[PDB]
Amino acid sequence: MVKVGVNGFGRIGRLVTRAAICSGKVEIVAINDPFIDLNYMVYMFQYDSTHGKFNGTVKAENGKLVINGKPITIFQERDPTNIKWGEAGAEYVVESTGVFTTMEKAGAHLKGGAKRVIISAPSADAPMFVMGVNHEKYDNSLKIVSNASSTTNCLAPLAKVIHDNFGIVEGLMTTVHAITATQKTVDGPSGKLWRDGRGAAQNIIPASTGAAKAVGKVIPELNGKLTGMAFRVPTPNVSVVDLTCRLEKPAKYDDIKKVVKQASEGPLKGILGYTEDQVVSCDFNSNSHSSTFDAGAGIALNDNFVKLISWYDNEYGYSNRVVDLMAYMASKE
Amino acid sequence: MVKVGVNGFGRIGRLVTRAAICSGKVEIVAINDPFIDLNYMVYMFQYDSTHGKFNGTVKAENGKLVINGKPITIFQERDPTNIKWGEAGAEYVVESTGVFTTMEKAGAHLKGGAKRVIISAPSADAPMFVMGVNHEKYDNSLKIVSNASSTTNCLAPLAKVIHDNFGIVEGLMTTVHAITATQKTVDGPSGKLWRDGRGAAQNIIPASTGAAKAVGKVIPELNGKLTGMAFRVPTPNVSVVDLTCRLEKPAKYDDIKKVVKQASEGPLKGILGYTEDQVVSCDFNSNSHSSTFDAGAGIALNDNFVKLISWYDNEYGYSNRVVDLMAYMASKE
Amino acid sequence: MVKVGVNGFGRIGRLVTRAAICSGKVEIVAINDPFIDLNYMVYMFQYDSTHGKFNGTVKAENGKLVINGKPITIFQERDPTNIKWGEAGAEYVVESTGVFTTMEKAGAHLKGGAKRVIISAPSADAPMFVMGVNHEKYDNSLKIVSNASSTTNCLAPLAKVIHDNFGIVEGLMTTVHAITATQKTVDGPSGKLWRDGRGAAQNIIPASTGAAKAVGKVIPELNGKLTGMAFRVPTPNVSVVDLTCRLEKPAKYDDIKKVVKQASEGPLKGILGYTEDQVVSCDFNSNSHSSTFDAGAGIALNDNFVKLISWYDNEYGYSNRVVDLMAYMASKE
Amino acid sequence: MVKVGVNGFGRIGRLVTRAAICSGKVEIVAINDPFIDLNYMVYMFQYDSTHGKFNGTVKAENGKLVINGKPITIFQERDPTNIKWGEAGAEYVVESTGVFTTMEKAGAHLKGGAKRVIISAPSADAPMFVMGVNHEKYDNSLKIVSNASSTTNCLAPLAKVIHDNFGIVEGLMTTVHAITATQKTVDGPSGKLWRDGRGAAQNIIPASTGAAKAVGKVIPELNGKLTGMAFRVPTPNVSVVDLTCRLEKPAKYDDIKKVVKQASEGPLKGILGYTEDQVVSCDFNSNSHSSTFDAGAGIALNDNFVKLISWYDNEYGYSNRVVDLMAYMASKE
Numbered sequence A, B, C, D: 001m002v003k004v005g006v007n008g009f010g011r012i013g014r015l016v017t018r019a020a021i022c023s024g025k026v027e028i029v030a031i032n033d034p035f036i037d038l039n040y041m042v043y044m045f046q047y048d049s050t051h052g053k054f055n056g057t058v059k060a061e062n063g064k065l066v067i068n069g070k071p072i073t074i075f076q077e078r079d080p081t082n083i084k085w086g087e088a089g090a091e092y093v094v095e096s097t098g099v100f101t102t103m104e105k106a107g108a109h110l111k112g113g114a115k116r117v118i119i120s121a122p123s124a125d126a127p128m129f130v131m132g133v134n135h136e137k138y139d140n141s142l143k144i145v146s147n148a149s150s151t152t153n154c155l156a157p158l159a160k161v162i163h164d165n166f167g168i169v170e171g172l173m174t175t176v177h178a179i180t181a182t183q184k185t186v187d188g189p190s191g192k193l194w195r196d197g198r199g200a201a202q203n204i205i206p207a208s209t210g211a212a213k214a215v216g217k218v219i220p221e222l223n224g225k226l227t228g229m230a231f232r233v234p235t236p237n238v239s240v241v242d243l244t245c246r247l248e249k250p251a252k253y254d255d256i257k258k259v260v261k262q263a264s265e266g267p268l269k270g271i272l273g274y275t276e277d278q279v280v281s282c283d284f285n286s287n288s289h290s291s292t293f294d295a296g297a298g299i300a301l302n303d304n305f306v307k308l309i310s311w312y313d314n315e316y317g318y319s320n321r322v323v324d325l326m327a328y329m330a331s332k333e
């Protein structure tokens, strides 16, 4: 089983740690975050406004973070080249600071002894993967990879099923997306474009989504045929993809539901979900799926033009996919 | 000025009264609401969480509501049949309770002496109108009419400009829509619309939009070619239309911007607006336009497939249009 | 266990059911709610925006609501005198509609064969109880009782400990209180509680609290020496009491902490909690305590004048006390 | 009009600018911010989620910010010591960044040619003034002064009136305070103030504040007799002071209302307001008062122990007092 270091103990860093504990699929052995000391990590891991108090034990002892009795080595390095991953036994590093998303920057972790780096965001040049969609294109020569974004992990499984069965001629999508840590509590200086500095709990905010440029990398057959944007809205977690697409082969809405349900029970089980219930965003809080198709909420204008809806816990579904990708990579070693 | 009675002194009834009173296009002379007594009406009209305190005077005197010195007769009838509109001199009645939206129910106001009724919502059977789109189809034999919905009033002027210039082959739309009075503060009963009962400020909620069935009636050439749905999100006011459509004639995005800007400066001035600024929803609070095209937020996938974004103050833009529709109707008497 | 019927399957009615299942202390055998039909009850019990999806099974079968394989009789009566509690085997009825809080109205359930009634709110005339404070004043003659309110259940255990140990000369309190079902999503009619109709997600709203008139009944030595009010603020659940009191015997703040912690570990265990952690409201979501003293948040002006802070899940803590009171009542039978 | 430079174009700097233009009591001639370029300043000043779009013109021309046709010199200096206030004609400098609140640090603006510095925040060592309470203690030898905090400006005028008439023996205050820029959209790192990092729109968050202690310094006779704390709650603006105090002379609540109303109509006009209306927080958005007594929300436990409630727009009331303090200082030159 692969031993993991986490760089950036944030929303994703902490929920990747929870997912690793919940799934047992990888082992966290080290965490680096210069803004959160050991005692502070006890607090921030234990209490979570969105996902609730951790169901387990967490304490600081002998300089280590001890979760369910397992000690974790804690680093406090602002410069990732200074992190002694090898000494702590960290083989794979989750790069979840938000600020080292290029090959050049994320590769810093290789200097301290990490064997592979998984960027928890889209990358300008690291190869990007979505479990269930193109993870089989990974190979042992890729020491630096990206798990794309949470919107990309919601859109791409749904797009793949629809394209495989009916053929997407062209499509546009929107994600109605929960607020995130890059946004501001009140109108202030942005960090990525003017609209994104505006007060997050007051506003619907048009914004970019990583899926716009990533989906065509993860599904080359849809490059130039699909893109989209986001509206950030005042919820703390859970987002929803709104995919409007023209199909090559005619598809009754019942056939769409049928093939999506079949996919959710077979090859994409645990990745793509399917529901007909009268769900709202909070019903997906702490749901580990990448994408849950909402059959009741979609619209078929005609046999070749449809709107398809799919929910995703942008924090916890993505965090579980990070764990899944590392487990997959390790099985390939 | 036509003399106006307001049935239902709610978000729309009060803001219709504000719009009328400030901009004397019509004269409010009577108000009925059995759940808001006279002294309570003073308070509810004076203070408004969303649009600020009324800039003017409001008081109770001699059993009438006096706004900027003009006395208004106050009724407290549950049954519209029993409201003495004629005795109060009300010629047109705004039917803004939300529960009398059919011809049969809204026509009760004629029994008390009203001459015409304007339903502030879509109607299963009353003829529907959107200022700037089909209001010249009104004729004087229509005693009961509908002003459609706020989403219809945002979508239809934009769809008209796009269809007139390039031809909409097919389209689907979403409105990211502020919470309204039909929603609930915490998970509660909602009759047969189960998602609408879930806690409004906690969730993104898929929902119907009145635009879905109304837009094909106000633009008959688009009937069956355009529909959509809503996501209710935790903001108190201001909504945004996201229109994805295929065009018959190819159009560069700059060509779309040019015809929309031209429409906003000509025949649709005051109804359809145009901006290139980096706006978010709060920038439209108390904006009286029906539809403001957001040039920067849209996406062209190719010359025949686009996503177009348009903002609307669902409370205040619609309330101004109710006033405008009545002023137009009165001008044709 | 005593067999229980629930009148009003709302926030309290549903979480009383969850608390009963979690505790095993009582058995829900019947539920009445004319606004939630059988199939709708499945949905509202299964999905909860605040407390998450039910961890168990729930389905409708042969006209019963079946939770964890146990069937519950469902009634749909507006008028409580028509509910056949006796025939369904419901011995105690939880009166959680919010509209039958007097002895005369709540006594309707005895006509259908219920043996006792527990009003889930303060009552103008039914005896009121707070577990840990005055529950031993209950006796078998009381067929109609009240469990007071969630703020009373948070304030009264803390005031009891303070008063027993140091003597409360006089005090006033505030609860910063989550929004509830009586509030409105946007400015609307509230009846005679005018501030309570203002938009709940937009506003800090001064309001009454049931603790103001209840606390002097559950702690008679403090009647006229202690009262308070509320500010409703835009959170969906969890509230906090802010108790400012003058003490007869001087006490250092750490002396106060010691006696509260000692109370929390002894006779008030599970009712009064104690923490020194840097908590916020979400850390108490789904917490079954009546009152958790926040040692770090409070402040002393001097040895005889202090401000004491205590958290409470107003939904789930109160619901657990409703179950606890019924179990105590049943042990007295 | 004294000519004013603004250091820092955060919320306070921008709203001081708006207050100055709206009131015409001073003339803004220069703004320094090293993080916000001139085109971005146009945008942040023009659009405001909380207070609405600026009602006037704002443009970038010739390297200056031109508001209502009057050009403003823009600087971008990291080091206040290098800002050329004198060349721009700025006589008073509003020091609003938060990081130069000591006399040694704020005095850096004197080296660039400014004559006086007004710190828009509490200061360890500069003299602090609350208009209406102790501004008469200003004198022309004072080159560096502080305008205290918003909460101190709300509590102090109320405490002055209550102490002048009845004598405050001791008091404890809570402020229920809107979200501010120091908070985080989702749980994130907050240095040594752990609770302040928790998701702002999700949580009621206890927080320390020196404001009550500080009014014991601006009103020396209350030194040692006041302290308090805060709860941060999910609203974007407007806060409320909750003062529980013991009085030396007995006072009926009607006596309290009378002397507060008298003060608000006389010497504290525009600073201390008085209402009996059924107000909520949004009713004070963009209200320029420092403190508005809420007569209906307070409680008299007895003639010597009361809870007094007073509202404040923590952004705009304070910004207007900064302008008023500068106008007062200039009148004594």
Ligand SMILES: NC(=O)c1ccc[n+]([C@@H]2O[C@H](COP(=O)([O-])OP(=O)(O)OC[C@H]3O[C@@H](n4cnc5c(N)ncnc54)[C@H](O)[C@@H]3O)[C@@H](O)[C@H]2O)c1
Binding pocket: A007, A008, A009, A010, A011, A012, A013, A032, A033, A034, A035, A036, A077, A078, A079, A080, A096, A097, A098, A099, A120, A121, A149, A150, A180, A181, A182, A314, A315, A318, D187, D188, D189
């Ligand atoms: N829904 C989501 O939040 C989500 C989902 C998928 C991917 N992502 C992406 O994951 C990444 C992290 O997102 P997040 O929401 O967890 O942000 P976050 O702000 O919650 O976490 C970032 C963490 O990195 C720490 N950090 C900052 N600089 C550091 C440095 N030099 N070295 C080590 N640690 C540092 C921070 O202290 C913080 O704890 C981003 O790339 C983001 O866009 C976010």
Ligand SMILES: NC(=O)c1ccc[n+]([C@@H]2O[C@H](COP(=O)([O-])OP(=O)(O)OC[C@H]3O[C@@H](n4cnc5c(N)ncnc54)[C@H](O)[C@@H]3O)[C@@H](O)[C@H]2O)c1
Binding pocket: B007, B008, B009, B010, B011, B012, B013, B032, B033, B034, B035, B036, B077, B078, B079, B080, B096, B097, B098, B099, B120, B121, B149, B150, B180, B181, B182, B314, B315, B318, C187, C188, C189
């Ligand atoms: N954004 C909006 O809020 C919006 C926009 C456009 C159209 N509309 C439509 O306007 C109508 C009212 O919407 P609203 O948002 O103002 O709702 P609201 O709940 O704020 O107002 C409804 C008013 O009707 C009163 N009322 C209820 N029953 C009545 C009766 N028998 N007789 C007289 N008055 C009665 C109520 O007391 C209330 O004041 C609905 O049809 C709605 O879909 C709403």
Ligand SMILES: NC(=O)c1ccc[n+]([C@@H]2O[C@H](COP(=O)([O-])OP(=O)(O)OC[C@H]3O[C@@H](n4cnc5c(N)ncnc54)[C@H](O)[C@@H]3O)[C@@H](O)[C@H]2O)c1
Binding pocket: B187, B188, B189, C007, C008, C009, C010, C011, C012, C013, C032, C033, C034, C035, C036, C077, C078, C079, C080, C096, C097, C098, C099, C120, C121, C149, C150, C180, C181, C182, C314, C315, C318
């Ligand atoms: N935090 C809280 O929510 C809280 C805490 C303690 C006590 N309480 C009190 O509990 C009671 C219910 O509060 P709630 O928050 O659960 O409100 P709610 O609106 O969520 O629940 C009320 C339920 O009663 C149903 N109902 C209405 N009329 C009925 C009738 N004639 N017969 C049967 N059922 C009917 C409604 O359909 C609804 O499902 C109130 O008295 C309340 O003040 C609430």
